[PDB]
Design a protein around this ligand. Structure first.
Ligand SMILES: Nc1ncnc2c1ncn2[C@@H]1O[C@H](COP(=O)(O)OP(=O)(O)OP(=O)(O)O)[C@@H](O)[C@H]1O
Ligand SMILES: Nc1ncnc2c1ncn2[C@@H]1O[C@H](COP(=O)(O)OP(=O)(O)OP(=O)(O)O)[C@@H](O)[C@H]1O
Ligand SMILES: Nc1ncnc2c1ncn2[C@@H]1O[C@H](COP(=O)(O)OP(=O)(O)O)[C@@H](O)[C@H]1O
Ligand SMILES: [Mg+2]
Ligand SMILES: [Mg+2]
Ligand SMILES: [Mg+2]
Lengths: 394, 219, 384
């Protein structure tokens, strides 16, 4: 009944919100200013305290010290090199050589040491955040998980069963099979459960534009990794980063091989990486280099084969546990109809047959809705199939 | 002046170089292969002559170069394309080692695993003198190698290393070391504390990396 | 601003009357409280006095710098415009949330301290790849397919407009769509109809322009393409003629075939990486389907595979009806003689005849198109 009466009493109080919030100060949509009722801490005091007593302290880089005296040799970006001194506020302990320090603009003396440069394209490839894939989603390949999981996390979660027995456990592992088998999926489950830094690297990010540029990114990776206590490096699609050394005539693919040699040097020999565990995952391993396939770098060699029969029946129970189905369907009949099929196809069977239920009207799939999806995915897309020239890995 | 070690990659080449760094009390100085490759021109060239001037200063000093085929790739004539800058760091490493103004104060240890890649200008006789090769272990060394890495493990006296060296053919010093670590982990699965002979034989099947396909229809 | 998101009665109820009269009380009490601040503590205007205090703090020369790190106790290392970088402090009116490494900032002139941040002027490649307006007419312009028109709405349009049908089924929509067939059958034409209909941002790139001239510049362009696609919205990425990345070799590319391959490995990542993908649909189109890598066409990266046939002789008659709709067609012509002229004429051949026959009319200043226009049209278009 009171059709306008609720409306205009709604409208003015929705306006009376804005009409006084303009009288407080959030307005003047800025080009980089703050909320005005938030900066009141530095409004009178620290405006004249963080500015007028505090100075700029231009940052530099130290070449070396010398004996008998401080007399530090310093360096800046393009300008000259000076001979400098400390302040009183810092000890001469942590002014070690090759270290960035802040330096005043007048006397040129050292104020404070700095953290080193991180080369920010290496900073982005730290994962910081965990996916939602659990080992309960990697069904069908239980023995491959167990032989993997005893290398990555059991020395980290229990570093006493290995020490007191007196064995140094393996450090590297590669994961290889046909595509769509579950290689990248199983690596997501490791980053889910772990606790150390998980630094991922995709092998097509180390190809650079200059000469020797890509080999320096391999160092800055392992520089920040040795600072951490335990860390887990993930290499994906490493058939890009190096296959083999084959140089003939005109030197071709020479530049990528220097990046691959620097990676080999950071894994073995001469005061080693310590507590860093690597994890590669390739698609065709026949191209890879024999000096990289050597144990001590890539100890475990987990195979991801195609599921046999009970591997397949368990995958249907994963990708169709959460969908409206007829109760009386059997999955064991379906797994006999897909002889050499990947786990990726079995998911696409389940997602296709739900669409047939959405095609006409209905709300739950039937047994024949699966069979209409089997011959379309398996036997009608069989021209592509992606597998049979990858079982031979060529 | 100048030695060269070469061979298959698991035969132990770093292992002598880490041995000699612990024996002589001189200035040991180590290098990576692709460390002498820089974006700006002349920086890789300047980086070489700084090293042989620093080892000139410490008059007892030996210098080590690992994975020399990063820079020592054979030169080639090509139009329209081709790297040149990496040849500059090599052509000074030829000269700064041997040629004009020689010296006998530093010794060079070089380690590669492939030799046919290399430019013959650095295999001449005087730049790299003694070219020693590291073959794969024949039979008796494989008994000796896995005896070394089985030192810290609780091994029962049921082991025949002459048998274990003989059921491991075509391995190298890395793979023989890799058997001792894998057999030391299979016993942790079954809860045993000592090592038996069958733990090593199961460790060999993991290092060989066989493919399991339903094959019991022979014989 | 975002004061209350509840609207759910949607009637003349007392509850909608009561809720907003509660909010009427919370507003006026907030008003009358903050009214008493300037009554008892006038002390400034607060409209410009705190503003001009800031504006007299920050100098009239305002240099623009560049972040490269942040230390959280309001001082960070910033880069000057020259290259000599400093270690200045950060203010409190600086709203410390829009500070990423590489973001443009505002420094002081004297002590170079971080005053403000600057909005970015981006980008001369985002606006290259972003389709601004809707291209052309609707799905009614196509005619004759009717089986795969349903298929593309099934994967793109219906997941966006009706997000209820998949939830009641408990399913996720199919990921990738590829379109293949003989040349000129309407592959690019259907993607215009999707760009007509959708509300998502639509990104288009030819497969030929993925290849570059510098090393590593190719895979860098793929990484920043899917960067742009994710950072907007639900979005559609359309990649046209992706066989052209592999068939043609160009001497501008310094790396040979083993740089094309590293480009394809990066694209092979971006479709099914382990990173959380988000809401980005991918449409791909080609005519040489047997050439490209089957590792890229596996289910998981591309789910639906749609074939286009050559037009049938009753669907050809539909196409002549479409492209001769708004033209003053003289009654001399018979369209059925034009249908079986070529046994396998595409849909592109029909529009090529219909436009060129109109051009023959303007040579003689006419307004209608006769039969001998079409007689000399197919001699000009087809037979050469
Ligand atoms: N055993 C499995 N159980 C459940 N899902 C699986 C399984 N194997 C694969 N999948 C499906 O495969 C997809 C991930 O495939 P993944 O990326 O691991 O392929 P891959 O083995 O890495 O090959 P590629 O490198 O070509 O991607 C996921 O959608 C996942 O649902
Ligand atoms: N079935 C059709 N219905 C309506 N118009 C069509 C049809 N087929 C082709 N055309 C006309 O042909 C022109 C070109 O079509 P389009 O380029 O989409 O074919 P294509 O297969 O994408 O070509 P290409 O193989 O060269 O990419 C369009 O402008 C359209 O007007
Ligand atoms: N007696 C031995 N003979 C050969 N190799 C050994 C011996 N003892 C240990 N090793 C293994 O050889 C490895 C040395 O690596 P190495 O073959 O020098 O690499 P590369 O030759 O590729 O630089 C060590 O990891 C060590 O485990
Ligand atoms: Mg993968
Ligand atoms: Mg070595
Ligand atoms: Mg087209």
């Amino acid at each position: 009944t009171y059709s306008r009466q609720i409306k205009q009493v709604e409208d003015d109080i929705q306006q009376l919100l804005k009409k006084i919030n303009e009288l407080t100060g959030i307005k003047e949509s800025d080009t980089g200013l703050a909320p005005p009722a938030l900066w009141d801490l530095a409004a009178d005091k620290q405006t004249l305290q963080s500015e007028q007593p505090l100075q700029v302290a231009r940052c530099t880089k130290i070449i070396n010290a010398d004996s008998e005296d401080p007399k530090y040799i310093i360096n800046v970006k393009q300008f000259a090199k000076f001979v400098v001194d400390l302040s009183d506020q810092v000890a001469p302990t942590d002014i070690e050589e090759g270290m960035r320090v802040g330096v005043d603009r007048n006397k040129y003396q050292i104020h404070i040491p700095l953290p080193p440069k991180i080369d920010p394209t290496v900073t982005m490839m730290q994962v910081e955040e965990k996916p939602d894939v659990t080992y309960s989603d990697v069904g069908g390949c239980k023995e491959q998980i167990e032989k993997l999981r005893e290398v990555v996390e059991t020395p980290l979660l229990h570093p006493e069963r290995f020490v007191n027995l007196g064995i140094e456990p393996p450090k590297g592992v590669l994961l290889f099979g046909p595509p769509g088998t579950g290689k990248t999926l199983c690596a997501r489950a490791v980053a889910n459960r772990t606790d150390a830094c998980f630094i991922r690297v995709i092998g097509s990010e180390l190809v650079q534009k200059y000469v020797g540029e890509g080999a320096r990114m391999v160092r800055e990776l392992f520089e920040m990794a040795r600072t951490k206590k335990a860390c887990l490096i993930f290499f994906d699609e490493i058939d890009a980063i190096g296959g083999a050394r084959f140089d003939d005539g005109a030197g071709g693919d020479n530049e990528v091989q220097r990046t691959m040699l620097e990676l080999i040097n950071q894994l073995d020999g001469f005061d080693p990486r310590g507590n860093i565990k690597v994890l590669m995952a390739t698609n065709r391993p026949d191209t890879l280099d024999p000096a990289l396939m050597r144990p001590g770098r890539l100890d475990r060699k987990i195979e991801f084969s195609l599921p046999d029969l009970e591997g397949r029946t368990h995958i249907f129970k994963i990708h169709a546990r959460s969908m409206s189905v007829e109760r009386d369907i059997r999955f064991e009949l379906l797994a006999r109809l897909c002889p050499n099929s990947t786990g990726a196809e079995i998911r696409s069977v389940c997602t296709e047959a739900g669409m047939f239920a959405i095609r006409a009207r209905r709300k739950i799939a039937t047994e024949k809705d699966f069979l209409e999806a089997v011959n379309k995915v398996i036997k009608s897309y069989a021209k592509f199939s992606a597998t049979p020239r990858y079982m031979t890995y060529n | 002046k100048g030695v060269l070690m070469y061979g298959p990659p698991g035969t132990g080449k770093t292992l002598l170089a880490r041995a000699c760094a612990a024996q002589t009390k001189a200035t040991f100085l180590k290098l990576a292969g692709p460390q002498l490759v820089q974006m700006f021109i002349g920086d890789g060239a300047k980086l070489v002559r700084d090293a042989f001037a620093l080892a000139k200063e410490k008059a007892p000093s030996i210098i080590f170069i690992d994975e020399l085929d990063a820079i020592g790739t054979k030169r080639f004539d090509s139009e329209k394309a081709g790297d040149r800058e990496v040849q500059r760091t090599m052509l000074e490493l030829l000269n700064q080692l041997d040629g004009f103004q020689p010296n006998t104060q530093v010794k060079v240890i070089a380690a590669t695993n492939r030799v046919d890649i290399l430019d013959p200008a650095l295999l001449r006789s005087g730049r790299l003198d003694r070219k020693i090769e590291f073959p794969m272990p024949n039979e008796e060394a494989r008994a000796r190698i896995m005896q070394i890495h089985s030192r810290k493990m609780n091994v029962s006296p049921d082991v025949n290393y002459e048998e274990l060296a003989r059921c491991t053919d075509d391995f190298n010093g890395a793979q023989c070391k890799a058997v001792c670590v894998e057999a030391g982990m299979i016993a942790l699965r079954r809860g045993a504390t000592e090592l038996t002979h069958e733990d090593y034989m199961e460790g060999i099947l993991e290092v060989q990396a066989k493919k399991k396909a339903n094959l019991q229809y022979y014989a | 601003a975002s004061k209350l998101p509840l609207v759910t009665p949607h009637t003349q109820c007392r509850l909608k009357l009561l809720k907003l009269e509660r909010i009427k009380d919370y507003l006026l009490m907030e008003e009358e409280f903050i009214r008493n601040q300037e009554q008892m503590k006038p002390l400034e205007e607060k409209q410009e006095e705190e503003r001009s205090k800031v504006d007299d703090l920050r100098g009239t020369p305002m240099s623009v710098g560049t972040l490269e790190e942040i230390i959280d106790d309001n001082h960070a290392i910033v880069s000057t415009s020259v290259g000599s970088e400093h270690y200045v402090s950060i203010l409190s009116f600086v709203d410390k949330d829009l500070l990423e490494p590489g973001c443009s900032v505002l420094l002081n002139h004297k002590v170079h301290a971080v005053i403000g941040v600057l909005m970015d002027d981006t980008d001369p490649l985002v606006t290259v790849m972003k389709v601004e307006k809707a291209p052309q007419e609707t799905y009614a312009d196509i005619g004759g397919l009717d089986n795969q028109i349903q298929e593309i709405k099934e994967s793109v349009e219906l997941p966006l407009t009706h997000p209820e049908y998949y939830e009641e089924m408990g399913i996720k929509p199919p990921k990738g769509v590829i379109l293949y067939g003989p040349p000129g059958t309407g592959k690019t034409l259907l993607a215009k109809a999707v760009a007509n209909q959708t509300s998502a941002t639509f990104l288009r790139v030819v497969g030929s322009e993925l290849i570059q001239k510098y090393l590593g510049d190719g895979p860098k362009l793929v990484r920043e393409l899917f960067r742009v696609a994710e950072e907007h919205a639900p979005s559609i990425v359309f990649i046209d003629e992706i066989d052209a990345i592999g068939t043609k070799r160009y001497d501008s590319n310094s790396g040979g075939e083993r740089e094309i391959q590293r480009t394809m490995l990066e694209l092979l990542n971006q479709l099914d990486g382990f990173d959380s993908r988000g809401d980005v649909k991918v449409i791909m189109a080609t005519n040489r389907i047997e050439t490209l890598d089957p590792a890229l066409i596996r289910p998981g990266r591309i789910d639906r595979k749609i074939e286009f046939p050559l037009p049938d002789e009753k669907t050809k008659k539909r196409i002549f009806q479409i492209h001769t709709s708004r033209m003053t067609l003289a009654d001399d012509v018979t369209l059925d003689d034009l249908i079986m002229a070529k046994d396998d004429l595409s849909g592109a051949d029909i529009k090529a005849i219909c436009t060129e026959a109109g051009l023959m009319a303007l040579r003689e200043r006419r307004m209608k198109v006769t039969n001998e226009d079409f007689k000399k049209s197919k001699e000009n278009v087809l037979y050469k």
